[PDB]
């Protein structure tokens, strides 16, 4: 029975998870590259494993190696039942990474509407740029995203008040 707490999770493997996590203190416990179990799960859209490691006390803000978050992983994938239970536990919306990016230029990226307005509700800045100086705003015009676009732009326009 070799395999990894985080593959148990992935897999979303309830009964082999559970007995892991309980006989001894692995839940927060990173792999070789710095990914918790939240990680891997949330990265696989295991909704019913993300459920389970938040209700027995996983890290949600505990962050991998080049600072990846589980919400920033479910961000780029769209998985919108992840990313709720994930702000649901007050994580910071706008985690800037050493990749460069945040939860919102991930969501951008994919062209996951749905995850763009779950995480602008959220507290999300879609005007924080990286680096090279661009924003989620530029991102969406330069990928051509037009709903998204549209929403970021409804956004803006309620900051006009001001």
Same mark, same amino acid.
């Given at each position: 029975n070799s395999l990894s707490v985080h593959q148990l999770a992935a897999q979303g493997e309830m009964l082999y998870l559970a007995t892991r996590i309980e006989q001894e203190n692995v839940i927060n416990h990173t792999d070789?590259?710095?990914?918790?179990p939240l990680m891997w799960a949330a990265a696989h859209g295991q909704i019913a494993v993300v459920e389970f490691l938040l209700q027995n006390g /996983?890290?949600?803000? &505990? &962050?991998?190696?080049?600072?990846?978050s589980a919400l920033s992983l479910a961000c780029s994938k769209g998985y919108t039942d992840i990313v709720k239970m994930l702000l649901d536990c007050g994580v910071d919306v706008n985690e800037y990474d050493w990749?460069? @990016?945040?939860p919102l230029l991930y969501a951008v990226h994919g062209n996951h509407v749905k995850c763009v307005k779950m995480l602008l509700e959220s @507290? /999300?800045?879609?005007?924080?740029?990286?680096d090279s100086g661009y924003n989620s705003m530029d991102l969406a015009v330069a990928l051509g995203y037009r709903s998204v676009q549209q929403v970021i732009e409804s956004h803006l326009l309620k900051l006009l008040q001001n």
């Open positions: 070789e590259e710095g990914f918790t /996983a890290d949600p803000q &505990l &962050l991998g190696k080049g600072r990846e990749n460069g @990016g945040t @507290g /999300a800045d879609p005007t924080i740029e990286t």
